[PDB]
Enzyme design. Structure first.
Site, PDB file in Angstrom:
ATOM      1  N   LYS A  14      -6.605  -5.255  -4.905  1.00  0.00           N
ATOM      2  CA  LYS A  14      -5.387  -5.647  -4.217  1.00  0.00           C
ATOM      3  C   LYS A  14      -5.313  -7.150  -3.985  1.00  0.00           C
ATOM      4  O   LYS A  14      -4.272  -7.761  -4.218  1.00  0.00           O
ATOM      5  CB  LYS A  14      -5.267  -4.900  -2.882  1.00  0.00           C
ATOM      6  CG  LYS A  14      -5.392  -3.395  -3.027  1.00  0.00           C
ATOM      7  CD  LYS A  14      -4.809  -2.675  -1.820  1.00  0.00           C
ATOM      8  CE  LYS A  14      -4.825  -1.168  -2.027  1.00  0.00           C
ATOM      9  NZ  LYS A  14      -4.203  -0.448  -0.890  1.00  0.00           N
ATOM     10  N   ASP A  56      -6.917  -2.456   2.800  1.00  0.00           N
ATOM     11  CA  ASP A  56      -5.822  -3.411   2.579  1.00  0.00           C
ATOM     12  C   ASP A  56      -6.167  -4.801   3.156  1.00  0.00           C
ATOM     13  O   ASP A  56      -5.522  -5.801   2.819  1.00  0.00           O
ATOM     14  CB  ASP A  56      -4.520  -2.935   3.255  1.00  0.00           C
ATOM     15  CG  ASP A  56      -3.969  -1.652   2.658  1.00  0.00           C
ATOM     16  OD1 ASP A  56      -3.901  -1.563   1.411  1.00  0.00           O
ATOM     17  OD2 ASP A  56      -3.598  -0.747   3.438  1.00  0.00           O
ATOM     18  N   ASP A 109       0.897  -1.138   0.000  1.00  0.00           N
ATOM     19  CA  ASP A 109       0.000   0.000   0.000  1.00  0.00           C
ATOM     20  C   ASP A 109       0.950   1.206   0.000  1.00  0.00           C
ATOM     21  O   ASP A 109       2.124   1.092   0.368  1.00  0.00           O
ATOM     22  CB  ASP A 109      -0.819  -0.012   1.283  1.00  0.00           C
ATOM     23  CG  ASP A 109      -1.654   1.226   1.449  1.00  0.00           C
ATOM     24  OD1 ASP A 109      -1.572   1.851   2.532  1.00  0.00           O
ATOM     25  OD2 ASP A 109      -2.389   1.556   0.501  1.00  0.00           O
ATOM     26  N   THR A 154      -2.201   1.053  -4.704  1.00  0.00           N
ATOM     27  CA  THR A 154      -2.826   2.137  -3.976  1.00  0.00           C
ATOM     28  C   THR A 154      -4.154   2.617  -4.517  1.00  0.00           C
ATOM     29  O   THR A 154      -4.450   2.486  -5.708  1.00  0.00           O
ATOM     30  CB  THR A 154      -1.853   3.355  -3.936  1.00  0.00           C
ATOM     31  OG1 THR A 154      -2.439   4.441  -3.205  1.00  0.00           O
ATOM     32  CG2 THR A 154      -1.516   3.808  -5.364  1.00  0.00           C
ATOM     33  N   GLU A 176      -5.403  21.260   4.541  1.00  0.00           N
ATOM     34  CA  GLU A 176      -5.498  22.550   5.205  1.00  0.00           C
ATOM     35  C   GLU A 176      -4.521  22.604   6.371  1.00  0.00           C
ATOM     36  O   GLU A 176      -3.940  23.651   6.662  1.00  0.00           O
ATOM     37  CB  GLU A 176      -6.912  22.806   5.706  1.00  0.00           C
ATOM     38  CG  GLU A 176      -7.928  22.978   4.592  1.00  0.00           C
ATOM     39  CD  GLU A 176      -9.075  23.870   5.005  1.00  0.00           C
ATOM     40  OE1 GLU A 176      -9.648  23.628   6.089  1.00  0.00           O
ATOM     41  OE2 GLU A 176      -9.399  24.811   4.247  1.00  0.00           O
ATOM     42  N   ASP A 202      -2.062  -0.507   5.791  1.00  0.00           N
ATOM     43  CA  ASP A 202      -2.490   0.133   7.020  1.00  0.00           C
ATOM     44  C   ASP A 202      -3.991   0.373   7.082  1.00  0.00           C
ATOM     45  O   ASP A 202      -4.561   0.485   8.162  1.00  0.00           O
ATOM     46  CB  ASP A 202      -1.741   1.460   7.185  1.00  0.00           C
ATOM     47  CG  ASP A 202      -2.234   2.536   6.229  1.00  0.00           C
ATOM     48  OD1 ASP A 202      -2.462   2.251   5.037  1.00  0.00           O
ATOM     49  OD2 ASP A 202      -2.395   3.682   6.670  1.00  0.00           O
TER      50      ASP A 202
END
Ligand SMILES: C/C=C(/C)C(=O)O[C@H]1C(C)=C2[C@H]([C@@H]1OC(=O)CCCCCCC)[C@@](C)(OC(C)=O)C[C@H](OC(=O)CCC)[C@@]1(O)[C@H]2OC(=O)[C@@]1(C)O
Ligand SMILES: Nc1ncnc2c1ncn2[C@@H]1O[C@H](COP(=O)(O)OP(=O)(O)O)[C@@H](O)[C@H]1O
Ligand SMILES: [Mg+2]
Ligand SMILES: [Mg+2]
Ligand code: NA
EC number: 7.2.2.10
Length: 994
Positions: free
Chosen positions: A684, A707, A351, A625, A442, A703
């Site tokens: 994946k 995944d 990932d 990803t 932000e 993580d």
């Protein structure tokens, strides 16, 4: 309702015959709740006590010992009243071991955290719907929601089901879909249809997914699917991969029992055929009803001799030791049989966000205008260090530190970033780290302002909690934000209207600070700032600005760029319709361009090096990803997966592109491509499956909950220490320190552990070969029992048990990580090693029988027929005057057996040193290399003499002390075993392959 995303709002309402103004009627709910079930993910189970127990006795080898122990138990009861006091020893020692190795097997399985339980934590208990009953929203149980009802979500809510958005009430609806894409960046939703039927989740901007949460806004929609039919439901179904697949080593151990269970019976057949003249002569002692006790005797001794009863114990002890070793390296292992497998890894899928990267948006580049002179326009570009939200890092220019405050432009830049912001920073004292409050893109600005410290505010004395917003608070003390013109899709920008908070800045007066997509903002600028001055926007100045922005957004940089500006003369507060966002673009006109900031989710420091080390070990690394292709590829180049200029045309794919390929191509792409982007959770696991289809040992690092499927499907699932619980519960290992380097160390550990296991396994099994040879000779030659099951178990459990464990401590090679991954199908022993151990076995089988026959013939304690008539010892009580002339209870004496056992033991203690290395003489590699092995042999011999002296033992083991002459004989027939093996090695180390 399928394909709700490709349908218009009207069609989705029509599909369920519901009004957006009233919702479902109670009858509809009851009906739909009957057809579609409850909106919840089904829990799992199956760990039935009366099942997990039967599994422990499912192995072919444990069954043989189960039968043997029983057959041995019947022979214990149907035993002569001579000394049936300690006859059930064997039957119980076996039953004890079985229930022992079995009760432990249920321990590792009963103690298992459920990934599904952790996943269901994303299912909100309550939801809000509009039903025909009332006109006001009803807050009901999420599980009671059904396809078709009108639902409402607002800031902070956790989406209750997969919903087609019908109407957004706020200016924009912000959604965090990280559980499906791994990205925390909020996605801006809309209500228009998304045509493409094969659209991926990240393309379905008109849908809300169960498990996701609203970052900002309020909207109304219609439920399309619930329960298992949702996206998080697909994750759940994939997590239901109960079918447990055994590792390569475990597979090698299963085929061993296969052939073993064959050879055993085969030998049992040989024995039943060698004794042709058994019932040919008038025999009365061998009853046809009760006489097969001879076979049910050897059948047991054979099994106990072939089966390395102690192997399963030495393996676990070795793995346990390795596990603690890795924990020392911050590698927490949840699955013991994984340590070995990690060393066979040839492909590591990974990932990106939060795994390869920090998952912390960081501004790394910014610029303001330097000079303007007709066609000439120069810029002041700076780089910024730091990869986290922590206010730690410097502002550099030409790779050299500078003081932001020195540049007026930077002062305004920082002011815009501090004010035109809705997030902040917070120090989590509990975890000891800085965390974001609000959106990632932000907070990057907030963090940026803290590093720049344009007013040189003293922050050294301040504490963590205070440092977090020290510089931002300074600017808020100078300029007050009165109101915000919230971001809107039509404009792709946002602004804040501010005025001075101190008369000392009265000159600034009313100002509007703007930030947003570069193109739109720049087009709305008529001026550009140069220090504190201002000149008009010209073609050359504009092209200069855009040209740099273009480079930053798509090269080695590929940064997310934001243009910053300020309206020097904003409209009167009273001339602005603040409740009509469609008016905001006009208010953000006639702007003065100030600068640009470039940010990205940066790779972790030790990743680049880790990738290279993996490559040296023949281990490939593939990125998978949910993020976009462009930034995914840029990161691959940054961390070395791709070369700086490497062509990636067919080495990188998006999820949609990948599915577009035919099943055949898909399979090969997984071997060539190293980058998959815009992926869904199922992508994946699908690519992991393909890799495995080529019989490759693949690992997956991740993580997020996106995944999970892949972490589960992979042989070794590796989860980040700071990742999600779902990811951790679905993995075999956890990197407590999120340090990628630990993976390489774990792989090395795995290869080192395997090499040692490969040794004590050969040592133990080699031993069983001799034991079976003995039983075969002392059965075919009609000789008297040289060794009994009770004696064998002690050897395969303690005598050799210790030495085996000590072998797991052999020092690892040096080029271990400099060599490629071993083939999964590589046999533990074959070819020359086969023959090599084929001989060592034959020897042991002769040294033991001979040591017994020796006492019965040439010894000075009980001479026998030097004409091998020792074979007919059975016919001593039937016809004594035959060719005897002595007591018949002599063929049961403890002396001969003790002689044989001492030979076996001694041979093994010597064959242990022979196990310190495969093809290396004990001279090229001395025994004192493994101090544990030596200390192991001593603990064995002592335990050996312990059985020959402590009276309460020799009886149960049928053993008896030996002389200095007796022992000499043992050391004379055992010691030469070292010479034999030392020679066999030479035969290959200098001829075959050496
Ligand atoms: C435990 C004791 C014994 C004697 C046994 O039957 O082991 C055999 C056996 C089943 C195999 C053999 C043993 O075969 C023989 O020794 C040939 C028959 C001689 C018997 C004569 C009667 C006195 C292993 C042990 O040994 C040698 C010395 O050749 C090597 C190897 O084993 C491995 O690779 C270990 C896997 C954990 C296996 O050929 C294996 O079969 C397979 O499928 C393998 C691939 O596994
Ligand atoms: N809060 C914000 N203030 C100013 N600009 C923003 C803000 N959020 C997003 N933007 C800008 O608007 C763009 C978002 O476009 P959008 O259509 O919603 O999605 P996408 O990122 O897939 O293009 C971003 O690339 C960014 O430059
Ligand atoms: Mg867009
Ligand atoms: Mg991630
Ligand atoms: Na797994």
């Amino acid at each position: 309702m399928e394909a709700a995303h490709s349908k218009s709002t009207e069609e989705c309402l029509a599909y369920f015959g519901v009004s957006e103004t009233t919702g479902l009627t109670p009858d509809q709910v009851k009906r739909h709740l009957e057809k579609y079930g409850h909106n919840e993910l089904p829990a799992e189970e199956g760990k039935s006590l009366w099942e997990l127990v039967i599994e422990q006795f499912e192995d072919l080898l444990v069954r043989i010992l189960l039968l043997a122990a029983c057959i041995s138990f019947v022979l214990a009861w149907f035993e002569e009243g001579e000394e049936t006091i300690t006859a059930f020893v064997e039957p119980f020692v076996i039953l004890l071991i079985l229930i022992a190795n079995a009760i432990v097997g249920v321990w590792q399985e009963r103690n298992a955290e459920n990934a599904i339980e952790a996943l269901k934590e994303y299912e909100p208990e309550m939801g809000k719907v509009y039903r025909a009953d009332r006109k006001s929203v009803q807050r009901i149980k999420a599980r009671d929601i059904v396809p078709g009802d009108i639902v409402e979500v607002a800031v902070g809510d956790k989406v209750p089901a997969d919903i087609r958005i019908l109407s957004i009430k706020s200016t924009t609806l912000r959604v965090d879909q990280s559980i499906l894409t791994g990205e925390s960046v909020s996605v801006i939703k809309h209500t228009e249809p998304v045509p493409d039927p094969r659209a991926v989740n990240q393309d379905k901007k008109n849908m809300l997914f169960s498990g996701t949460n609203i970052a900002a806004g309020k909207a109304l929609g219609i439920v399309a699917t619930t329960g298992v039919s949702t996206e998080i439901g697909k994750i759940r179904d994939q997590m239901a991969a109960t079918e447990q697949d055994k590792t390569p080593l475990q597979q090698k151990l299963d085929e061993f029992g296969e052939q073993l269970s064959k050879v055993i019976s085969l030998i049992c057949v040989a024995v039943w055929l060698i004794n042709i003249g058994h019932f040919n002569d008038p025999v009365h002692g061998g009853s046809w009803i009760r006489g097969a006790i001879y076979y049910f005797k050897i059948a047991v001794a054979l099994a106990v001799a072939a089966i390395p009863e102690g192997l399963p114990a030495v393996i676990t002890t070795c793995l346990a030791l390795g596990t603690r070793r890795m924990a020392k390296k911050n590698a927490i292992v949840r699955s013991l049989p994984s340590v070995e497998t990690l060393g066979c890894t040839s492909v590591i899928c990974s990932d990106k966000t939060g795994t390869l990267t920090t998952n912390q948006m960081s501004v790394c580049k910014m610029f303001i205008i330097d000079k303007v002179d007709g066609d000439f326009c120069s810029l002041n570009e700076f780089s910024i260090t730091g990869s986290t939200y922590a206010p730690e890092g410097e502002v550099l220019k030409n790779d050299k530190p500078i003081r932001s405050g020195q540049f007026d432009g930077l002062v305004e830049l920082a002011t815009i970033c501090a004010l035109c912001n809705d997030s902040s920073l917070d120090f989590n004292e509990t975890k000891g780290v800085y965390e974001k409050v609000g959106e990632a893109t932000e907070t990057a600005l907030t963090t940026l302002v803290e590093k720049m410290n344009v007013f040189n505010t003293e922050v050294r004395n301040l504490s963590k909690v205070e440092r977090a917003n020290a510089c931002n608070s300074v600017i808020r003390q100078l300029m007050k934000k009165e109101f915000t013109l919230e971001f809107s899709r039509d404009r792709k920008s946002m602004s804040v209207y501010c005025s001075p908070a101190k008369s000392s800045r009265a000159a600034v007066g009313n100002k509007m600070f703007v930030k947003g997509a570069p193109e739109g903002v720049i087009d709305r600028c008529n001026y550009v700032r140069v220090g504190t001055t201002r000149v008009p926007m010209t073609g050359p100045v504009k092209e200069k600005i855009l040209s740099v922005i273009k480079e930053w957004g798509t090269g080695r940089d590929t940064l997310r760029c934001l243009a910053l500006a300020t309206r020097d003369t904003p409209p009167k507060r009273e001339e602005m319709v603040l409740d009509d966002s469609s008016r905001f673009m006009e208010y953000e006109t006639d702007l003065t361009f100030v600068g640009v900031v470039g940010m990205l989710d940066p790779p972790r420091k030790e990743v680049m090096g880790s990738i290279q080390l993996c490559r040296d070990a023949g281990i490939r690394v593939i990125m998978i990803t949910g993020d976009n292709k462009g930034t995914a590829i840029a990161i691959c180049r940054r961390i070395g997966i791709f070369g700086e200029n490497e062509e990636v045309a067919d080495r990188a794919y998006t999820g949609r592109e990948f599915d577009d390929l035919p099943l055949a191509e898909q399979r090969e792409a997984c071997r060539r491509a190293c980058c998959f982007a815009r992926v869904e959770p199922s992508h994946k696991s699908k690519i992991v499956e393909y890799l495995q289809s080529y019989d490759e040992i693949t690992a997956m690092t991740g993580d997020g909950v996106n995944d999970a499927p892949a972490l589960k499907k992979a042989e070794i699932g590796i989860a980040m220490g700071s990742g999600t619980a779902v990811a951790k519960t679905a993995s075999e290992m956890v990197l407590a320190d999120d340090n990628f380097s630990t993976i390489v160390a774990a792989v090395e550990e795995g290869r080192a552990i395997y090499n040692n296991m490969k040794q004590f396994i050969r040592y133990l099994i080699s031993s069983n070969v001799g034991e079976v040879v003995c039983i075969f000779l002392t059965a075919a030659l009609g000789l008297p029992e040289a060794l009994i099951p009770v004696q064998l178990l002690w050897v395969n459990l303690v005598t050799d048990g210790l030495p085996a464990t000590a072998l797991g401590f052999n020092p690892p090679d040096l080029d271990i990580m400099d060599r490629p991954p071993r083939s999964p199908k590589e046999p533990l022993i074959s070819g020359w090693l086969f023959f090599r151990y084929m001989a060592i076995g034959g020897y042991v089988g002769a040294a033991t029988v001979g040591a017994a026959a020796w006492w019965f013939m040439y010894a000075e304690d009980g001479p026998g027929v030097t004409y091998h008539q020792l074979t007919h010892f059975m016919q001593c009580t039937e016809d004594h005057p035959h060719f005897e002339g002595l007591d018949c209870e002599i063929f049961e004496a403890p002396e001969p057996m003790t002689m044989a056992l001492s030979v076996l033991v001694t041979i093994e203690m010597c064959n242990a040193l022979n196990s310190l290395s495969e093809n290396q003489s004990l001279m090229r590699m001395p025994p004192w290399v493994n101090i544990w092995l030596l200390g192991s042999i001593c603990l064995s011999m002592s335990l050996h003499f312990l059985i020959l002296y402590v009276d309460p033992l020799p009886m149960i083991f049928k053993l008896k002390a030996l002389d200095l002459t007796q022992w000499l004989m043992v050391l004379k027939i055992s010691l030469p075993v070292i010479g034999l093996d030392e020679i066999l090695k030479f035969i290959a180390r200098n001829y075959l392959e050496g």
